[PDB]
Design an enzyme around this catalytic site. Structure first.
Site, PDB file in Angstrom:
ATOM      1  N   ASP A   8       2.698 -12.992  14.196  1.00  0.00           N
ATOM      2  CA  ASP A   8       1.945 -11.749  14.090  1.00  0.00           C
ATOM      3  C   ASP A   8       0.458 -12.068  13.946  1.00  0.00           C
ATOM      4  O   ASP A   8      -0.036 -12.284  12.839  1.00  0.00           O
ATOM      5  CB  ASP A   8       2.446 -10.921  12.902  1.00  0.00           C
ATOM      6  CG  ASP A   8       1.748  -9.582  12.785  1.00  0.00           C
ATOM      7  OD1 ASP A   8       2.122  -8.649  13.527  1.00  0.00           O
ATOM      8  OD2 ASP A   8       0.834  -9.459  11.944  1.00  0.00           O
ATOM      9  N   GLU A 760       3.145 -11.145  18.697  1.00  0.00           N
ATOM     10  CA  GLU A 760       2.623  -9.791  18.570  1.00  0.00           C
ATOM     11  C   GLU A 760       1.148  -9.840  18.197  1.00  0.00           C
ATOM     12  O   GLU A 760       0.747 -10.615  17.333  1.00  0.00           O
ATOM     13  CB  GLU A 760       3.395  -8.996  17.516  1.00  0.00           C
ATOM     14  CG  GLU A 760       2.793  -7.628  17.223  1.00  0.00           C
ATOM     15  CD  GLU A 760       3.363  -6.986  15.973  1.00  0.00           C
ATOM     16  OE1 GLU A 760       4.247  -7.596  15.339  1.00  0.00           O
ATOM     17  OE2 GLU A 760       2.921  -5.873  15.621  1.00  0.00           O
ATOM     18  N   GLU A 764      -4.971  -2.630  14.672  1.00  0.00           N
ATOM     19  CA  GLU A 764      -5.855  -2.222  13.591  1.00  0.00           C
ATOM     20  C   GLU A 764      -5.557  -0.780  13.204  1.00  0.00           C
ATOM     21  O   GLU A 764      -5.775   0.137  13.995  1.00  0.00           O
ATOM     22  CB  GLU A 764      -7.321  -2.376  13.999  1.00  0.00           C
ATOM     23  N   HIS A 838      11.455  17.057  23.196  1.00  0.00           N
ATOM     24  CA  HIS A 838      10.849  16.063  24.075  1.00  0.00           C
ATOM     25  C   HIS A 838      11.137  16.382  25.537  1.00  0.00           C
ATOM     26  O   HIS A 838      12.289  16.588  25.921  1.00  0.00           O
ATOM     27  CB  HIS A 838      11.361  14.660  23.740  1.00  0.00           C
ATOM     28  CG  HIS A 838      11.096  14.238  22.329  1.00  0.00           C
ATOM     29  ND1 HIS A 838      11.818  14.722  21.259  1.00  0.00           N
ATOM     30  CD2 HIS A 838      10.190  13.375  21.811  1.00  0.00           C
ATOM     31  CE1 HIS A 838      11.367  14.177  20.143  1.00  0.00           C
ATOM     32  NE2 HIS A 838      10.378  13.356  20.450  1.00  0.00           N
ATOM     33  N   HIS A 981       2.916  -8.814   6.948  1.00  0.00           N
ATOM     34  CA  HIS A 981       2.547  -9.649   8.088  1.00  0.00           C
ATOM     35  C   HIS A 981       3.709 -10.569   8.459  1.00  0.00           C
ATOM     36  O   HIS A 981       4.147 -10.620   9.617  1.00  0.00           O
ATOM     37  CB  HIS A 981       1.300 -10.480   7.777  1.00  0.00           C
ATOM     38  CG  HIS A 981       0.103  -9.665   7.396  1.00  0.00           C
ATOM     39  ND1 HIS A 981      -0.564  -8.855   8.291  1.00  0.00           N
ATOM     40  CD2 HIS A 981      -0.560  -9.551   6.221  1.00  0.00           C
ATOM     41  CE1 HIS A 981      -1.578  -8.268   7.679  1.00  0.00           C
ATOM     42  NE2 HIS A 981      -1.599  -8.676   6.423  1.00  0.00           N
ATOM     43  N   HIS A1295       1.454  12.899 -16.104  1.00  0.00           N
ATOM     44  CA  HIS A1295       1.874  13.582 -14.883  1.00  0.00           C
ATOM     45  C   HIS A1295       3.309  13.237 -14.498  1.00  0.00           C
ATOM     46  O   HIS A1295       3.601  12.981 -13.329  1.00  0.00           O
ATOM     47  CB  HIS A1295       0.933  13.233 -13.727  1.00  0.00           C
ATOM     48  CG  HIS A1295      -0.503  13.560 -13.994  1.00  0.00           C
ATOM     49  ND1 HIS A1295      -1.283  12.832 -14.866  1.00  0.00           N
ATOM     50  CD2 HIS A1295      -1.301  14.537 -13.502  1.00  0.00           C
ATOM     51  CE1 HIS A1295      -2.499  13.346 -14.901  1.00  0.00           C
ATOM     52  NE2 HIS A1295      -2.537  14.382 -14.082  1.00  0.00           N
ATOM     53  N   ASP A1326      -6.482  11.869 -11.929  1.00  0.00           N
ATOM     54  CA  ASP A1326      -7.802  12.210 -12.441  1.00  0.00           C
ATOM     55  C   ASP A1326      -8.519  10.980 -12.990  1.00  0.00           C
ATOM     56  O   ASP A1326      -9.748  10.908 -12.978  1.00  0.00           O
ATOM     57  CB  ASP A1326      -7.691  13.282 -13.526  1.00  0.00           C
ATOM     58  CG  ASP A1326      -6.824  12.842 -14.690  1.00  0.00           C
ATOM     59  OD1 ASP A1326      -7.371  12.285 -15.665  1.00  0.00           O
ATOM     60  OD2 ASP A1326      -5.594  13.052 -14.630  1.00  0.00           O
TER      61      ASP A1326
END
Length: 1364
Positions: A8, A760, A764, A838, A981, A1295, A1326
């Site tokens: 990769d 491969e 990005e 489709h 990766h 939370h 927050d």
RNA sequence: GAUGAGACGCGUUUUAGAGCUAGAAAUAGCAAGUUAAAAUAAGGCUAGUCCGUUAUCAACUUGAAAAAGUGU
């Protein structure tokens, strides 16, 4: 045993994995070197290398050229002094010596502190008589009296040191310098560029308007007032504004999404202009160039104001007048201030820290800042008239040396120098003898084609010497072999075609190139008249007629001109419709019309015998910028044309290069057809193939010819192979790293080469800056579509670009708020009940874009077929789709797919197109990488001259592995760790090997090499899944990734079933076990030990910060020169550490100077690096160390890995800061849970599985607490940030009742605390959590240094605690 | 899609442009400023009107170096 490698490749990382035949990753025992008790480690053959981005050579280039410029200028001054020396010796003994020591303080100065005369009296008299050098110059031009030789030298040296630009060639004249002529040239370029609604300016007085002394905006408006048809916000108005020094925005002029502002004075103008030009084409280049020229003219006219009687030395006289005016305005200002505003007087003329006048003169305050500061003061006082009119005109209290002086040509300084030399010629005979010498010193400029005047020891130089003597400006012509130098220059500057090597690329303004692109655009044009009712591509005769009649008559050809002046005039066609081109033809025969305008001989331009000649001329005009070499290379064509046309032809210049060669365009030939590329473009029968299609089409010999020619003769270096690639230095670095990774991996496997290497190129991910761009584009698309249609849906249902991110809503507005298959309106607030269908089923092709998606109440409306939607719907909805097509709501291809049933339905060619769309890699760089690896792996041969391919290099698209992840829930979350990766590499290996096992005959598609191409008949069956294991057909459904699936859902809802075990038909080999193999993949992805290695690098670059700080008593500053004490002269600060070093020695401590044994971490700066590497012990002893152990001196680059207590790891960032060195390994179940929880609303899948996924998220709420426990333990172990951990734990407790989605997202954000590398601030709900830095670096000195190989499999561990 | 050649103008840093008048100083009133020289990665040897911020770089062994070797 047998194995394969998965890779990769990225710009900051390289993933790698080793797999077996069972798709398993081997675990092996590796030896451990060093001085610890660990001699062995068990490791998984999977990992990822991490590294800093490669940098481009631009900054270095700028610095280099700057150095050359400083050097050469100083050398010019040395030439002048060399001429003046002997006669100066009679006048003054220590003049030049005093000039050289000007920088030194009186203490270090051996001579008198007064430079010019050596005594204070003559110095004071000189400075009082001439307060600026321009006074002295103007006198020396205007005085018949004898002058001191020293002052003469001062003038000449001042004129030579700062000699002015060389933008204008030849003698100075109003034709290329006056504002009027350049304005006329500008509007000529404008009218040439348009000719439709052009501006005509003959009565206008450009000089009186533009050169007038007024504010910028009012000058612009005054020029606009003379043009009733044009306005200030127009294109021409923005051009004028640009020429005046303003900042116009060309966004509104081209309807660009992002605002494009240009300012000539701004340093970042060039790349901005290049971006704009990249957007609108290079046709507008000469326009902006003319704008720049006009600007320089206006500035030059603005400084040379003393045009009164036009006597003497106009530039110097103008500077004098500026001095006088400055004095007047200053005294008047002081008078007004003292009179009206007594308070705060000190702040204006004494403080200088807050940008006063004292800040303007003695401080770092620009003219605009000074103006901005004193403007309200002038506004507040009375009698401030006249001072403000000068201020707005940017001519108030101006200095003589400003940023405006760039517009000053060298011909002026040449004029004054010639004048001075002529005045003092008879008084000093050696000025008469050496006049032409000095003049040559000022005027001489090294040509581009000559380059650096080296003698073999320069990497950048190429020039040839016809002698062996020091090159001077005077003997340059007779020592430098300009011919051979220009030839070498040509050979170097000619880039080779990426498509076809061994062939030089043609210039961008080549005639054959323009013909090529014009025919390439013209061949894709279809026309429909009244009667045929079917689209027809242009025939050869029609194309030739169109080119000759239109393209060779006008620079711009529009569709209206095309239909009116060809179809109606020659073809007698009253009504015509064109789909191929838009408003006008983007391509043009610019060079043709340029040459036509130059030589005025049209017949000569169409002679096919004169092609090579004209191409040679264009090449010459492209390559060179120097007049002499152009004259030399155009001397052969002197008999062809003469006088005006020859000079005007020599004055013509072209810039830029194409991408294609002559041999490619009109050289290589199809064996059967006997037609070149260009011949095919001109004539190709009914169907017309474009360039890319001839390259693509395998039915012709062109692809074979391009491929067989790719490999250059002989075998060169790896470095050269990588350098030849077309990509950023970053990806090249990644490629090199990849190659080394492969080498080490094949070393690890007992020097056994793998069967397969799958590659491969990592994509990005969205930078989010385009995340607003997509919404903007689709929004503009919606608004244009709505305005075109006329349905005010935006009125009744207003939307913003943010909400348009939703798929069903976006399709809702794309489909005019109407059903695609049914004649009924969609429910605005019931889109959840509605399904997205489709056009081309998933069983045939994996396309989830908007290009293949529709919105409807039920996908049963597509009809009964497993194909495209039925004909019964197409016949009914063709009109509405045709309305949506011309309204740019949908593309042509989408309309083609929607109406495919009308043309029979899906075909073998379409399915083959799908296969090629899924299996082939379009990126060239990837093919070249595969080529490199193939060349490095296979090097054996046989008895014949045939290449033996032991190792197969497979090329994969990211979409395959990505979709593989999404379909079988092997979800990826990048924020957790760097494992993804390695995982991507593994999955690449798996998918690649599976594909090569399933479809061996499709090897030619991915695998690099010369294989049997095969066709479309043998691969795809005629119809149905007829006779399993009784036919040679590989697949009826065109999707290659179907055999991984257990079930196949068609467009009907019918569920096709596939065996539990997938096997190859021809060789009877099992390719996939849907239970054990998926279990294996999941097991591999679940493994916690993955080899993550951060590439250690020595820091390179500038020595320190470039800002020259003033003198201070601090000893921290670095001297600008070894003799110049920073305490007296000042210097640099903040040095850059190349790497750190481990030193064991003793130091002196206390008054007794007793030696104490110490172990310290010393940082070696880039400057210190040479001295240190030359002799380390002497360096350290000079640094203050005693009795150093040379053996224990350890080099520690950045990102050096150390291990401490409980597996806690730290990377060395600098001599005084550390980074986190551990990777949090989170179980696959938590990863999948986090993905599904985060991707809750945006599942984009079928309802059946989606609801089950929602339920899966809801059932496992405990996973949140479990994950928080994981992060907590991990942090408590290796991060050691109690405060932040407490904060995020409390914040998590607050939370707890919050929805699972946002909570999971905030946990994903929380992963930044545990991420490998430098500490970063992150936001949790927050609460904002600031970075917890590691400022202490002492613990490293007793930790375990870990030296890692590139894969991390080989380790050398040094226990530093044992050293001391 | 990278790599290269030529040139300009600012900027910054020291120094040269004599500060003048009071007051025991401390500190107060003013007079003026626009320019120039020099350095502009420290420097390097190969001494060129050349080179010095890109690429490249775990450890150990062998080599001046390109580079070979060392671990089920």
């Amino acid at each position: 045993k047998k194995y394969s490698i998965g890779l990769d490749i990225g710009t900051n990382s390289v993933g790698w994995a080793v797999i077996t035949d069972d798709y398993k990753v081997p675990s092996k025992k590796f030896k451990v070197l060093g001085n610890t008790d660990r001699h062995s480690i068990k490791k998984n053959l999977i990992g990822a290398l991490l590294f800093d981005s490669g940098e481009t050579a631009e900054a270095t280039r700028l610095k280099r050229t700057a150095r050359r410029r400083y050097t050469r200028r100083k050398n010019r001054i040395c030439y002048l002094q060399e001429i003046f020396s002997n006669e100066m010796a009679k006048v003054d003994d220590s003049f030049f010596h005093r000039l050289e020591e000007s920088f030194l303080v009186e203490e270090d100065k051996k001579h008198e502190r007064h430079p010019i005369f050596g005594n204070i009296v003559d110095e004071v008299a000189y400075h009082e008589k001439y307060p600026t050098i321009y006074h002295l110059r103007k006198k020396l031009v205007d005085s018949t009296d004898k002058a001191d030789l020293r002052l003469i030298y001062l003038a000449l040296a001042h004129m030579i040191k700062f000699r002015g630009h060389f933008l204008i060639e030849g003698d100075l004249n109003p034709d290329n310098s006056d504002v009027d002529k350049l304005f006329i040239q500008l509007v000529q370029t404008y009218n040439q560029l348009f000719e439709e609604n052009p501006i005509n300016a003959s009565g206008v007085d450009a000089k009186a308007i533009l050169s007038a002394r007024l504010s910028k905006s009012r000058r612009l408006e005054n020029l606009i007032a003379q043009l009733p048809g044009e306005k200030k916000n127009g294109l021409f108005g923005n051009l004028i504004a640009l020429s005046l020094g303003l900042t116009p925005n060309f966004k509104s002029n081209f309807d660009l999404a992002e605002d494009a502002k240009l300012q000539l004075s701004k340093d970042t103008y060039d790349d901005d202009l290049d971006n704009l030009l990249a957007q609108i084409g290079d046709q507008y280049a000469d326009l902006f160039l003319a704008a720049k020229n006009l600007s320089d003219a206006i500035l030059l006219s603005d400084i040379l104001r003393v045009n009164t009687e036009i006597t003497k030395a106009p530039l110097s006289a103008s500077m004098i007048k500026r001095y006088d005016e400055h004095h007047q305005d200053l005294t008047l200002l002081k008078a007004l201030v003292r009179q009206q505003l007594p308070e705060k007087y000190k702040e204006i003329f004494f403080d200088q820290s807050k940008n006063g006048y004292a800040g303007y003169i003695d401080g770092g305050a620009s003219q605009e800042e000074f103006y901005k500061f004193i403007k309200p003061i002038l506004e507040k006082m009375d009698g401030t008239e006249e001072l403000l009119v000068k201020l707005n005109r940017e001519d108030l209290l101006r200095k003589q040396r400003t940023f405006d002086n760039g517009s000053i040509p060298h011909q002026i300084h040449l004029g004054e120098l010639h004048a001075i030399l002529r005045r003092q010629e008879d008084f000093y005979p050696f000025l008469k003898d050496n006049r032409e010498k000095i003049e040559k010193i000022l005027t001489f400029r090294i040509p581009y084609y000559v380059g650096p005047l080296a003698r073999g020891n320069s990497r950048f130089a190429w020039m040839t010497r016809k002698s062996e003597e020091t090159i001077t400006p005077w003997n340059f012509e007779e020592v430098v072999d300009k011919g051979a130098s220009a030839q070498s220059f040509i050979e170097r500057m000619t880039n080779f075609d990426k498509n076809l090597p061994n062939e030089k690329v043609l210039p961008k303004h080549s005639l054959l190139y323009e013909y090529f692109t014009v025919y390439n655009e013209l061949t894709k044009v279809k026309y429909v008249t009244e009667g045929m009712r079917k689209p027809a591509f242009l025939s050869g005769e029609q194309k030739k007629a169109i080119v000759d009649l239109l393209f060779k008559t006008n620079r711009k050809v529009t569709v209206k001109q095309l239909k009116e002046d060809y179809f109606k005039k020659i073809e007698c066609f009253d009504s015509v419709e064109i789909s191929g081109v838009e408003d006008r033809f983007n391509a043009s025969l610019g060079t043709y019309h340029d040459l036509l305008k130059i030589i005025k001989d049209k017949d000569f331009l169409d002679n096919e015998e004169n092609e090579d000649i004209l191409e040679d001329i264009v090449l010459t005009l492209t390559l060179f910028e120097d007049r002499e070499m152009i004259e030399e290379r155009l001397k052969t064509y002197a008999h062809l044309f003469d006088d005006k046309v020859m000079k005007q032809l020599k004055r013509r210049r072209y810039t830029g290069w194409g991408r294609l060669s002559r041999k490619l365009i009109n050289g290589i030939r199809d064996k059967q057809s006997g037609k070149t590329i260009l011949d095919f473009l001109k004539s190709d029968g009914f169907a017309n193939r474009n360039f890319m299609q001839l390259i693509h089409d395998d039915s012709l010999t062109f692809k074979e010819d391009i491929q067989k020619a790719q490999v250059s003769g002989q075998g060169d270096s790896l470095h050269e192979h990588i350098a030849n690639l077309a990509g950023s230095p970053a990806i090249k670095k990644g490629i090199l790293q990849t190659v080394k990774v492969v080498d080490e991996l094949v070393k690890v496997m007992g020097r056994h080469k793998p069967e397969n290497i799958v590659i491969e190129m990592a994509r990005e991910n969205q930078t989010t800056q385009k995340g607003q761009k997509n919404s903007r584009e689709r929004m503009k698309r919606i608004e244009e579509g709505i305005k075109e249609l006329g349905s005010q849906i935006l009125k009744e249902h207003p939307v913003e670009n943010t909400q348009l991110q939703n798929e069903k809503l976006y399709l809702y507005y794309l489909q005019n708020g109407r059903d695609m298959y049914v004649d009924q309106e969609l429910d605005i607030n019931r889109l959840s009940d509605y399904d997205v269908d489709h056009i081309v089923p998933q069983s045939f092709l994996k396309d989830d874009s908007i290009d293949n998606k529709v919105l409807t109440r039920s996908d049963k409306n597509r009809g009964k077929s497993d194909n495209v939607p039925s004909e019964e719907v197409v016949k009914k909805m063709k009109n509405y789709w045709r309305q949506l097509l011309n309204a740019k709501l949908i593309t042509q291809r989408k309309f083609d797919n929607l109406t495919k049933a009308e043309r029979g339905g899906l075909s073998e060619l379409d399915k083959a197109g799908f296969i090629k769309r899924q299996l082939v890699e379009t990126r060239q760089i990837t093919k070249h990488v595969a080529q490199i690896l193939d060349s490095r792996m296979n090097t054996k041969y046989d008895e014949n001259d045939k290449l033996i391919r032991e190792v197969k290099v497979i090329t994969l698209k990211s979409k395959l592995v990505s979709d593989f992840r999404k379909d079988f829930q092997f979800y990826k979350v990048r924020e957790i760790n760097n494992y993804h990766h390695a995982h991507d590499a593994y999955l690449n290996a798996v998918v690649g090997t599976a594909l090569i096992k399933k479809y061996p005959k499709l090897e030619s598609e991915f695998v690099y090499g010369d294989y049997k191409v095969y066709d479309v008949r043998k691969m795809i069956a005629k119809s149905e899944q007829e006779i399993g294991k009784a036919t040679a057909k590989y697949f009826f459904y065109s999707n290659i990734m179907n055999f991984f699936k257990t079930e196949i859902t068609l467009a009907n809802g019918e569920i096709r079933k596939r065996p539990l075990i997938e096997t190859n038909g021809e060789t009877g080999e099992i390719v996939w076990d849907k239970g054990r193999d998926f279990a294996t993949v999941r097991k591999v992805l679940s493994m916690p030990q993955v080899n993550i290695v951060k590439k250690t690098e020595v820091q390179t670059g500038g020595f320190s910060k470039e800002s020259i700080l003033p003198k201070r008593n601090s000893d921290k500053l670095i001297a600008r020169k070894k003799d110049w004490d920073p305490k007296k002269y000042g210097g640099f600060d903040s040095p850059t550490v190349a790497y750190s070093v481990l030193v064991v020695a003793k130091v002196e401590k206390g008054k007794s100077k007793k030696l104490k044994s110490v172990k310290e971490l010393l940082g070696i700066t880039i400057m210190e690096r040479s001295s240190f590497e030359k002799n380390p012990i002497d360096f350290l002893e000079a640094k203050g160390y005693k009795e150093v152990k040379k053996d224990l001196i350890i080099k520690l680059p950045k990102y050096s890995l150390f291990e401490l207590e409980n597996g806690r790891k730290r990377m060395l960032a600098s001599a005084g800061e550390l980074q986190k060195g551990n990777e949090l390994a989170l179980p696959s179940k938590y990863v999948n849970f986090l993905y599904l929880a985060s991707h809750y609303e945006k599942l984009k899948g079928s309802p059946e599985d989606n609801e089950q996924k929602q339920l899966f998220v809801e059932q496992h709420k405990h996973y949140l607490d479990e994950i928080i426990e994981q992060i907590s333990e991990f942090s408590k172990r290796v991060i050691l940030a109690d405060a932040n951990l407490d904060k995020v734990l409390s914040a998590y407790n607050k939370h707890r009742d919050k929805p699972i989605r946002e909570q999971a997202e905030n946990i994903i954000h929380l992963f930044t605390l545990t991420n490998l590398g430098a500490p970063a601030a992150f936001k949790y709900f927050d609460t904002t959590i600031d970075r917890k830095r590691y400022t202490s670096t002492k613990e490293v000195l007793d930790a375990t240094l870990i030296h890692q190989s590139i894969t991390g499999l080989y380790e050398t561990r040094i226990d530093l605690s044992q050293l001391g």
